[PDB]
Amino acid sequence: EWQENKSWNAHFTEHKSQGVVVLWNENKQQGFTNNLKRANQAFLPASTFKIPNSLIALDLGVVKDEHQVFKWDGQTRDIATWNRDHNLITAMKYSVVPVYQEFARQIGEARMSKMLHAFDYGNEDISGNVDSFWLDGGIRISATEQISFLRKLYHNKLHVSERSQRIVKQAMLTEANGDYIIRAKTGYSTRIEPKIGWWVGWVELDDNVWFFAMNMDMPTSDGLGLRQAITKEVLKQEKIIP
Numbered sequence: 001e002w003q004e005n006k007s008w009n010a011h012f013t014e015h016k017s018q019g020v021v022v023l024w025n026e027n028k029q030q031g032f033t034n035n036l037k038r039a040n041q042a043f044l045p046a047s048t049f050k051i052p053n054s055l056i057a058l059d060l061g062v063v064k065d066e067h068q069v070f071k072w073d074g075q076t077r078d079i080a081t082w083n084r085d086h087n088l089i090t091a092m093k094y095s096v097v098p099v100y101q102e103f104a105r106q107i108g109e110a111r112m113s114k115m116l117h118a119f120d121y122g123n124e125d126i127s128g129n130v131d132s133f134w135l136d137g138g139i140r141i142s143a144t145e146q147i148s149f150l151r152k153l154y155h156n157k158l159h160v161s162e163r164s165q166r167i168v169k170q171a172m173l174t175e176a177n178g179d180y181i182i183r184a185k186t187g188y189s190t191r192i193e194p195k196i197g198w199w200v201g202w203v204e205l206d207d208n209v210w211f212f213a214m215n216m217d218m219p220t221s222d223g224l225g226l227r228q229a230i231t232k233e234v235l236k237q238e239k240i241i242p
């Protein structure tokens with residue numbers, strides 16, 4: 001069911017880094033990784049939490065649809081793309097933390113905890129501040145656990161409406177061409193050691209789907225582009241994408 005290929009570590013060590021990539025072949029129900037131990041180690045989800053947060057906000061009516069405008073609160077932040085109005089699509093695309101912090105405040109502790117348990121999401125622990133627990137609270141999730149959650153979303157099997165799941169999968173759209181579609185979400189965790197980057201999602205082909213979840217050491221922001229680049233290089237090596 002699971003195969004470990006330690007030779008794939010070169011994808012990370014060649015960049016003076018360390019990390020894990022986990023792949024899941026949906027048709028064959030088989031998984032692959034470079035490091036079984038790190039594949040099951042739990043990290044802060046950081047901005048990958050925008051996936052469950054979006055689902056919960058939509059299903060509770062906190063967000064009406066993907067067109068609703070969330071007005072900039074007028075506070076200048078150091079990320080230029082955050083100093084503007086957003087909807088669900090652009091908030092996901094630019095990982096706009098302050099929009100999702102307001103989502104969480106409106107969801108509230110009780111409903112957030114209840115829904116993460118219903119999702120079987122990570123350690124299901126929202127200890128910390130309701131508007132930042134996915135950045136510096138007690139919640140943790142592993143790469144393998146990300147795969148399990150994403151598979152439920154793909155199949156519309158999460159305990160929210162089909163509509164809510166379709167809208168979030170639209171918002172996850174990252175790349176599409178004549179060969180494949182990628183729906184995914186990046187993450188960047190800096191408030192608790194070790195600092196890491198995430199990329200989780202899946203690749204749609206004509207006749208199969210490959211789920212993926214990766215994290216890697218991220219001592220500075222200079223390496224953030226390696227999250228997608230390394231993953232796509234693994235996918236190409238495995239002849240999943242051209």
Ligand SMILES: O=C(O)c1cccc(-c2ccccc2F)c1
Pocket residue numbers: 079093094095186188221224
């Ligand atoms: O990688 C991203 O999509 C992304 C989106 C928003 C902010 C950031 C970021 C970059 C450097 C330092 C702190 C940060 F939050 C990264």
